[PDB]
Each structure stands twice: as structure tokens, then as C-alpha cells.
Write a protein that binds this DNA or RNA. Structure first.
Lengths: 185, 49, 144, 57, 141, 48, 102
RNA sequence: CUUUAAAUCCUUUAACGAGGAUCCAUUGGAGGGCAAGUCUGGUGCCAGCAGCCGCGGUAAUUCCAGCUCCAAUAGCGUAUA
């Protein structure tokens, strides 16, 4: 009798077929194009899309003009709009079954920083996110798998402690200066 | 820099061994003259003695 | 080791080469009474007897060893003893002077299992002369 | 020959060689993208059986 | 099904019970004779004592001789035949040694060309046999 | 001098049959040996 | 047919003689030590040569068990009496052109 | 510095701290299922591999060792229910 939780669920899912050409082809294509680490995060993005698709199928199973159907139909559509992946004009319940993995991966923090033009490459963007340089509305984020909301898209900039956004120079810069006045004097 | 060998696993304990025999040596150079340990006596003999 | 002797007494046969004395024959057939002198090895109960010069035909199984009508179990080399030999059941009885004579040197019939049995644990009672006799009975019985 | 049933025969009498230079890693960002663009851009699909990436023939 | 009536269910249930009882894997898994006759006693791994080393012949198309170990089990006390897994590994073990034994992966059946052997050797003398093969660990003295 | 010592350490030892050759862990450490001798017999092979 | 190289014993071989023929692809041979051994047919000797009874056979000894062993190669008549003349076999070994009396 | 009965754990912050950034990522496989070399050298129905087909007979796309390659990745393989 302890005060614990014991509440945990799996986020990714393992596919049924272990070896196949084409599945590996677009999985490697998505990993290479979006700068992902390995297949676990694309499997968990597939699992989140599977959850949303199952909820949409269950909600469309129920008949029209039921208050529960309208209730979490409006809730799910409002959540998908607030993420920003869904367009405002596509305000319909059966449009949930018409988007794919790259739409969810478009709202990643890594590719949002890469499209903002303050980073050179996608892997350079992932390193720059990973190494505590970008704040999200006066709050630094060091992880790449961050879902940027639509309201927070226009408030992404460098950290004030980072040397890129204005601050103290880095460790190798002062070491280079110390070597410079060591060799000069 | 080349101070130790290629792997630090067999070179890291050398400083620890140097400190444990210098602790052994120093404990043998600061010694007391009186109030030493308790000696041992050793009873032996034949059966039915 | 006492129990090992008791249930391995029949399977263990000591080697023995025996020299026959002339004209000391009493019974020629059923049983075999012949006063025969030990020249090599030792004689025990149940030891078979054969002839090497007559393509290895067994004589019979012994019953008792008598030294001047006194039953002695073990007889060493150089003693004139009297041995009562009985024919084996299932085979025909033998007679003296026709099947075998007094001009033949008699040896004990031994088996390779008996040699192995004397090798494994019988180190105490098997001497250097008995080892040489073991080598000779290996070299005469066409066994390796 | 020695004997038929002596264990570790071909393990014992085989020759011994050493290793080579250390390879690098990019955690599959170009480690598998190199074989992807080898199979896509470099190697053309020839009408036949197959054409593998490790085919040293 | 065939007997299709609204107010009957126990006939279907009893027929399904009898037809499920008249099976092979269900009859093996739900009887005490199969677990009693199992040398492992329903365990994945077990420990035993090495007492003999023998060599069995293979099947007809595959002509070789395999090195296998006679092992007496600790929990039960009956002899089995166990097969050492990898090349050059019979010399790594000797007589009168504790050993860890496990099945091949056919749920208690012979695998390949080896007759009468359904178990394999994993660990001997509380050290892994794979580390003994690959030289990662040195054998106890 | 008897006041400064931190007590005394006592080792008892075997010496029956099949025990006289286990003095490696009994005699290689004890400083002052004491030999109890019986005057009825005197010398013994294990004592010498 | 051709006079090949006559091989001697190395570490693990012994000159045996077959005294009784076994079925199911197995063989029984009498080695020249005094004990009994059971023999198995080589995979290279599966049908190329038919080993009969009462002939000199080369058997490979096994160290962890001395009851089961394996044959190697067959000596038929001429290398048999030539190596008999070399003196490895003793006088007690009879070939006598396959006589069954012993 | 903070937390804490008092510390340790996390976070913040001085001074250190990376170029082959040796501050070195393994685990199983490469005939079919089933991603992946008719590569090189050795024993040549022996040693062995192999869940199943089957590979081993002195040209081994399967054994035993080096090079390359694929699979998942701080994780991977085996046996049991």
C-alpha cells in the first residue's frame, strides 16, 4: 500500500511485416527528409494518427444530431485547428480521414525552425534546438519533438543567454582569446 | 597529449595504487614507541596433558 | 571387497602352469584323480584345465586340492598336490592316456575378462612371476 | 588426420588475421541515405534479375 | 453450426466442450500426464550434473557424428541427453560439472538430424558458454 | 608493564591423530608458544 | 588397384579385424588390444567399398568413450601381409585368406 | 545556491572540460521465407551450420577467419506459458 501511480502506456507500435522494400523506402525517405533520429518517432506519429483515425471512425459510426457526436466532434476539430495542421476552412467532421504523416510532422519544432530561416540545414536545426539556443515565448526548449501551436508560431526566437541572440561569447571563443594573448604575449 | 596508455581502464588505478602504498609508507614512518598491540600466546601439547 | 570377492570368485581365475608327474595316476575318468605338482602360479577352486599342444581342449573343472589327503585351498609353486578334477556337465568326460598324456605341460584356462578382473583390483595377490605367467598365457592362448 | 571425432579441428587449424581502420557513423542520417541515393540516383533499374548495392561482381 | 434453435444453448456448449476436449494441443496443455512426463517439469531452464559424454550418429542424408552430453537432472532425478551448441565446446566442459540446460525450440521435440535429443546446453559452471567460445571470459579453474 | 597491554590473545590448538599437520593456520601467527607436557610420558613424535 | 602410399598409425588409430557383421549401417570389429568396440561406416565409405568379414580394418579411436569408434580405411590382402611383414601385427593375428574357423 | 527531519536526485550558476572531438555502440545475419557479396583465404560428408527446406564429396552464393553491405539501436538474441 504505497502512494504510487503505475500508469503508463506504449507510444510507438511495431509493424507486422519485419522486412519489406517499399515500407522501408518511404520510412527512410521521411526520416532523411525530416531529419529524424530513428524509426521509433515515425512509428509513434503513425500510432497517434491511428488513434485519431479510430476516434473519427467511432464518431462517424454514431448517427447525426446526437449531443455526444457534436460535443467531441467540436472538441476534436477545435483541437486539430489549435494545433494548426488543419486549415480553418475545412471545418467538417469527415475531413479527419484525409491527412497523412507529413502533415503532423510539418508542425514539429525542428522543421518549424528550419522553415523560419534562422538555421542552415535540418540537422543543424536539430542540433541547435538540442543545445539550448531557442526559446518559445521566454521559455527555452531543448527537445526537437515539440508540437508548435498556431498561436505560438510567431514567437520563436533565439535565447537571451545564447551567443547568437546576444549574450556572452561561448567557451571556445574565450579559449581562443586566451590562446591569442598567450601566443601574442 | 600522451601521458597514459591508449585505454584509461588499466591506467586510472595507478594513481590509486600510488596513494595506497604512500599511505602505507607514511603510516610506517610516523610510529609510536610505547603502548603497542596485544601479543598472542599459543597453547599446544600432547593428549591428556 | 569381501562382497566383491564373494560374487566375483567364479569369474576370477588365477593363471597357473602345471607340470604333470609320471605314473602317479589313480583314476583316469569320472572324476580325474591325478597327483600333479605346481610349477608356476597358484591353484584355486573352480580353475579350468586344458592342453596347449592339442588345439586347446579343456580337461575339466577342479573340485578340491589335497596335500597328503589334507584339503589346502591355495598351493604355491614347488609343492606336490593332489587335485580332484570333475568333467563339466554338457560335454563328454575325458580319460587319461588317450585324450591327454603325461608328456604334456598343463596350463590353466583363463579368459580376457578374468585378466581384466585380475588387473583392476587384484594388485595385492598378483606378483611379478604371476605377471610373467599372465604374459605367457596371453602368448600361448592366441589372445591379446 | 589424427582422428575423426576431435573437436575444434577447423577452429584450431585455421589461420589468424587482424582488424582494420575504424569506421564512422551519422546515426543513419546519411548511413542509410547513401544506399538510398545509390539505389535511386546511381544504380539504374536494369531489366533482369536484380542489381544489389553489395554486388562486387 | 448445424443445430440452430433459439431456446437451445447447452447442447451447443456441451458439443463444443467435447470437440475441444477431443483435440491434441488442448489435451496436452490441460492434462497432468504431459506435465508429469516432461523432464523439465514445466520450466524453461533447469540445472543438472554432467556424468557421461557420448556421440550419436546423425540421420540418413546428413552424415556426421554429433557430440552430446548425458545429464542427470537436479529437480527430478532422471537422465537426459543434451547437445552442446557450438563448435569446439566439448573440450570446454568435463565430467562432474553443474550445467544449465534448455530446449531447442520445438516445444519438446527433436530438431534436425539428431535423434533422441531435445535439449541444448546454455550455461556451464555459472559462466556463459558464448563468452567461453568468443574468449570474452576465461574458464574457472 | 602489565597495565598498558590491551588484554591477552589466546589460541587453542588440536593435536589428536589426523590433526598435527594443520598448524599452518594455527602456529604461523601466534607469537609466544606454550607447550604443556605430561611427565608420565614426556617426549612424543608430534611434540618434537 | 594402383599401389598407393602405405600409411602407418598416427595418434588415434589402431589396426582392428572384423569378426561379426552388424546391420543398420553399423559394424562390429575386434581391435588388437583385447576389448570390444562398435564401429560406424564412414560417409565417404558408404557404398564405394564393401567391407566384408575377417579382414584388417583401420579404426579411429575415441577418447571420451572407448566403446564406440569409427573405421577409416580398409586393408584387403597385399598391404595387409606387407605390413604384417613389417611387424606391427603380432604372430597371433591370422588372416589365412579369410578362414572362418579361427 | 536550492531541495530535504538532514542530505543525496532534478534545476540554476562560477572556474575546468572535444578534431582520428580514443569523450571509440553494440546485438544478430547475408541460398529461399527474409533486408542484405555467385568477395578473398583454410579443412575438404571431417569439423560444423541449419526454427523448416537443406548446405558439407579437395570450384562451399550456407562451415571456419578478414573486407563490404542490410536490419533495429542503448539496445539485441535464445528457451518456455
Amino acid at each position: 500500500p504505497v502512494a504510487r501511480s503505475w500508469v503508463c502506456r506504449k507510444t510507438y507500435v511495431t509493424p507486422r511485416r519485419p522486412f519489406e522494400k517499399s515500407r522501408l523506402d518511404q520510412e527512410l525517405k521521411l526520416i532523411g527528409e525530416y531529419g529524424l533520429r530513428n524509426k521509433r518517432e515515425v512509428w509513434r506519429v503513425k500510432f497517434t494518427l491511428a488513434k485519431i483515425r479510430k476516434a473519427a471512425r467511432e464518431l462517424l459510426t454514431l448517427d447525426e444530431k446526437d449531443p455526444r457526436r457534436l460535443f467531441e466532434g467540436n472538441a476534436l476539430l477545435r483541437r486539430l485547428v489549435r494545433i494548426g495542421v488543419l486549415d480553418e476552412g475545412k471545418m467538417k467532421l469527415d475531413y479527419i480521414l484525409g491527412l497523412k504523416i507529413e502533415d503532423f510532422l510539418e508542425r514539429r519544432l525542428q522543421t518549424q525552425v528550419f522553415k523560419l530561416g534562422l538555421a542552415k540545414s535540418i540537422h543543424h536545426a536539430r542540433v541547435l534546438i538540442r543545445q539550448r539556443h531557442i526559446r518559445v515565448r521566454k521559455q527555452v526548449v531543448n527537445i526537437p519533438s515539440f508540437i508548435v501551436r498556431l498561436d505560438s508560431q510567431k514567437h520563436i526566437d533565439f535565447s537571451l543567454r545564447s551567443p547568437y541572440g546576444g549574450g556572452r561569447p561561448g567557451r571556445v571563443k574565450r579559449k581562443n582569446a586566451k590562446k591569442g594573448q598567450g601566443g601574442a604575449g | 597529449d600522451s601521458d597514459d596508455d591508449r585505454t584509461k581502464e588499466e591506467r586510472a588505478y595507478d594513481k590509486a595504487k600510488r596513494r595506497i602504498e604512500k599511505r602505507r609508507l607514511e603510516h610506517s614512518k610516523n610510529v609510536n614507541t610505547e603502548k603497542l598491540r596485544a601479543p598472542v600466546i599459543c597453547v599446544l601439547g600432547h593428549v591428556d596433558t | 571387497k569381501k562382497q566383491k570377492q564373494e560374487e566375483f570368485k567364479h569369474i576370477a581365475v588365477f593363471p597357473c602352469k602345471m607340470k604333470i608327474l609320471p605314473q602317479y595316476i589313480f583314476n583316469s575318468r569320472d572324476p580325474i584323480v591325478m597327483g600333479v605338482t605346481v610349477e608356476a602360479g597358484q591353484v584355486k577352486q573352480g580353475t579350468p584345465m586344458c592342453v596347449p599342444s592339442k588345439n586347446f581342449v579343456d580337461i575339466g573343472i577342479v573340485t578340491s586340492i589335497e596335500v597328503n589327503h589334507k584339503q589346502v585351498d591355495v598351493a604355491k609353486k614347488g609343492q606336490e598336490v593332489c587335485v580332484k578334477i570333475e568333467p563339466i556337465p554338457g560335454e563328454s568326460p575325458k580319460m587319461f592316456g588317450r585324450h591327454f598324456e603325461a608328456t604334456d605341460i598343463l596350463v590353466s584356462k583363463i579368459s580376457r575378462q578374468s585378466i581384466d578382473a585380475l588387473k583392476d583390483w587384484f594388485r595385492d595377490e598378483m606378483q611379478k612371476s604371476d605377471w610373467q605367467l599372465i604374459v605367457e598365457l596371453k602368448k600361448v592362448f592366441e589372445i591379446i | 588426420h589424427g582422428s575423426l571425432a576431435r573437436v575444434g579441428k577447423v577452429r584450431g587449424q585455421t589461420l589468424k588475421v587482424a582488424k582494420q581502420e575504424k569506421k564512422k557513423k551519422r546515426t543513419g542520417r546519411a548511413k542509410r541515405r547513401m544506399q538510398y541515393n545509390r539505389r535511386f540516383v546511381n544504380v539504374v533499374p536494369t531489366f533482369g534479375k536484380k542489381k544489389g548495392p553489395n554486388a562486387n561482381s | 453450426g448445424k443445430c440452430r434453435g433459439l431456446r437451445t444453448a447447452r447442447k451447443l456448449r456441451s458439443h463444443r466442450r467435447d470437440q475441444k476436449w477431443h483435440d491434441k494441443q488442448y489435451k496436452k496443455a490441460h492434462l497432468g500426464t504431459a506435465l508429469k512426463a516432461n523432464p523439465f517439469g514445466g520450466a524453461s531452464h533447469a540445472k543438472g550434473i554432467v556424468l557421461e559424454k557420448v556421440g550419436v550418429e546423425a540421420k540418413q542424408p546428413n552424415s556426421a557424428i554429433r557430440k552430446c552430453v548425458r545429464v542427470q537432472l537436479i529437480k527430478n532425478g532422471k537422465k537426459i541427453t543434451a547437445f552442446v551448441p557450438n563448435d569446439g565446446c566439448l573440450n570446454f566442459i568435463e565430467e562432474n560439472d553443474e550445467v544449465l540446460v534448455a530446449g531447442f525450440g520445438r516445444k519438446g521435440h527433436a530438431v534436425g538430424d539428431i535423434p533422441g535429443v531435445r535439449f541444448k546446453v546454455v550455461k556451464v559452471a555459472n559462466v556463459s558458454l558464448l563468452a567461453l567460445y568468443k574468449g570474452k571470459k576465461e574458464r574457472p579453474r | 608493564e602489565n597495565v598498558r597491554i590491551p588484554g591477552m590473545l589466546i589460541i587453542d590448538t588440536p593435536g589428536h591423530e589426523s590433526f598435527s599437520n594443520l598448524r599452518n593456520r594455527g602456529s604461523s601467527l601466534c607469537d609466544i608458544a606454550i607447550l604443556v607436557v605430561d611427565i608420565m610420558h614426556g617426549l612424543e613424535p608430534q611434540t618434537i | 588397384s594402383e599401389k598407393r602410399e602405405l600409411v602407418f598409425k598416427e595418434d588415434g588409430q589402431e589396426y582392428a579385424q572384423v569378426i561379426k557383421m552388424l546391420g543398420n549401417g553399423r559394424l562390429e570389429a575386434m581391435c588388437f588390444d583385447g576389448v570390444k568396440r562398435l564401429c560406424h561406416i564412414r560417409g565417404k565409405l558408404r557404398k564405394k567399398v564393401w567391407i566384408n568379414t575377417s579382414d584388417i580394418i583401420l579404426v579411429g579411436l575415441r577418447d571420451y568413450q572407448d566403446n564406440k569408434a569409427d573405421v577409416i580405411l580398409k586393408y584387403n590382402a597385399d598391404e595387409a601381409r606387407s605390413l604384417k611383414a613389417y611387424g606391427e601385427l603380432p604372430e597371433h593375428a591370422k588372416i589365412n585368406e579369410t578362414d572362418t574357423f579361427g
